[PDB]
Amino acid sequence: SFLHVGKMGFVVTMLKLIQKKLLDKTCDQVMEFSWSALWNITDETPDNCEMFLNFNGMKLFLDCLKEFPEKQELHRNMLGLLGNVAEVKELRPQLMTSQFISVFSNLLESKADGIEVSYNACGVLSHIMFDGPEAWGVCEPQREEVEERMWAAIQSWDINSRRNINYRSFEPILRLLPQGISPVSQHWATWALYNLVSVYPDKYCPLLIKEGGMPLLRDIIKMATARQETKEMARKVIEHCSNFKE
Amino acid sequence: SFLHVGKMGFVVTMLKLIQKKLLDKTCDQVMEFSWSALWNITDETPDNCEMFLNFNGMKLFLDCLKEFPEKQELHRNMLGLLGNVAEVKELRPQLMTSQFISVFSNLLESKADGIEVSYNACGVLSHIMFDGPEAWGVCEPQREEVEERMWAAIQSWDINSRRNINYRSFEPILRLLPQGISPVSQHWATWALYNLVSVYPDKYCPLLIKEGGMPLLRDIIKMATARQETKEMARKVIEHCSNFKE
């Protein structure tokens, strides 16, 4: 259990603490815990994502990135949080600024904490791209050059990477499978499932099966808009999950 | 997404800071933050509960309770943390001393932050009772005395109490439903569900339904040996979750 985050104003409490550490130019255990807490309490919790945005959280995220460019665990926590914010469709338009898209695109090349910072940057952009080209506006970088960077990011990750992430539900990722708007978003979501069932099949094969990932992955194989590399990947997820279903 | 991992260096930073504020005899914003941080990172996270105990957590809890006997927010954070610790079967042996059981049973009548201190003291004791009488040994007060203080406390709580608590999973509470060792533990768990679906059905009716609470509550009603008081509370939970459903 935990306290009542809304009644306690707990998101604000963490952002006020982050602001104080940033001005003290200190990224210590307390700074990093504050971001880990926001990451955890935004998990499938849109009102907390919304409080983060409305308390000027993005500025704090960007100022911490600049002030602590090499603090890898700090970046992992900040990006876990942003991955949760990006799952809220009603909030994603606030992410569509040149300043923000620039940061996410650049983090696709992050080697911080293995692949976690690049992975969540890619997931943020995967949900953004899922809204389609109208949503992108005149943002520089070009939607195509970011999409190009996403394919490169995904393909650079060790498929057997051990992970510093967990999911109570695959629902937000599965969102990106039955869609032709954004093949790259579909490819990121397919890699995400493939990585987890390869390394952690005991935990994630049954979650994927129960939540209906099997037909969805079959549909990708017959989907004109799906890329060959996505179709072959989904075949291998289905295969891992079948060696488990016995 | 989330990450519920042990954080040995942070558990230790929080405890060493609590020790410092103890000796300074100031229960300030930092004192209360440290206990709330421990509450947060022990949520569904047994590893942090284990390091809490290994690094002298229980004595710091006891001392803080003695030093600051009227700091109700402190008590609420402290008992939220201890409620999380007590969920860990492997760790409950470290709680079986007369000193601790007397402390916890003497919090059953606490009026601090509504019912939260009373509720969490009862939860700690419910998991302890679930372990059976052999686990109690020679601890004082006697198990039967604490059991009656437990029924009394539960009955004293406003069934529609507003709450300063949050659960992301009901797993540890559901643990207490299909069991015949401790009726008072079963009753505590049923109340915990009943209050939450009664005050916040939109959050907790779907969670209870999703994690399989309905067959468990139905089983209690069908259990020839179950207490009718508990049967009827279980039935009201089923009723409200059915009223929630369409």
Residue numbers in the entry:
A (entry chain B), B (entry chain A): 514 to 759
Sentences reproduced from the published study:
ZER1 and ZYG11B, the substrate receptors of the Cullin 2-RING E3 ubiquitin ligase (CRL2), recognize N-terminal (Nt) glycine degrons and participate in the Nt-myristoylation quality control through the Gly/N-degron pathway. Here we show that ZER1 and ZYG11B can also recognize small Nt-residues other than glycine. Furthermore, we present the crystal structures of ZER1 and ZYG11B bound to various small Nt-residues and uncover the molecular mechanism of non-acetylated substrate recognition by ZER1 and ZYG11B. In conclusion, we propose that ZER1/ZYG11B not only targets Gly/N-degrons for proteasomal degradation, but it also has the ability to bind a defined selection of non-Ac/N-degrons by a conserved molecular mechanism of substrate recognition and target their degradation through the non-Ac/N-degron pathway.
To understand the molecular basis of ZER1/ZYG11B-mediated binding of non-Gly Nt-residue peptides, we determined the crystal structures of ZER1 bound to either SFLH-, AFLH- or TFLH-peptide, as well as the crystal structures of ZYG11B bound to either SFLH-, AFLH- or CFLH- peptide. In line with our SPOT-array results, ZER1 binds to XFLHVGQD peptides in which X is either Ser (KD of 1.3), Ala (KD of 1.6), Thr (KD of 3.1) or Cys (KD of 3.9) more potently than to the Gly-starting peptide (KD of 4.2). The free α-amino group of the Nt-residue forms hydrogen bonds with the side chains of Asp556 and Asn597 in ZER1 (the counterparts of Asp 526 and Asn 567 in ZYG11B), respectively. The main-chain amide of the third residue on the peptide is anchored by a hydrogen bond with Asn553 in ZER1 (Asn523 in ZYG11B). It is worth noting that the side-chain hydroxyl group of Nt-Ser makes additional hydrogen bond with the side chain of Trp552 in ZER1 (Trp522 in ZYG11B), suggesting a critical role of the Trp552 in binding of Nt-Ser. Apart from these direct interactions, a network of water molecules occupies the bottom of the cavity and mediates the contacts to ZER1 via water-mediated hydrogen bonds. However, on the other side, the Water3 in the Ser1-binding mode has to move down and away from the corresponding Water3 in the Gly1-binding mode (~1 Å) to provide enough space for docking the side chain of Ser1. Simultaneously, the Asn633 shifts toward Water3 to form a hydrogen bond, thereby leaving no space for Water4 in the Ser1-binding mode. As a result, the Water3 mediates contacts directly with Water2, Gly593, Asn633 as well as Ser1, while in the Gly1-binding mode the Water3 together with Water4 establishes a contact network with Water2, Gly593, Asn633 as well as Trp552. These rearrangements of water molecules might explain why ZER1 is able to recognize other Nt-residues in its narrow substrate-binding pocket.
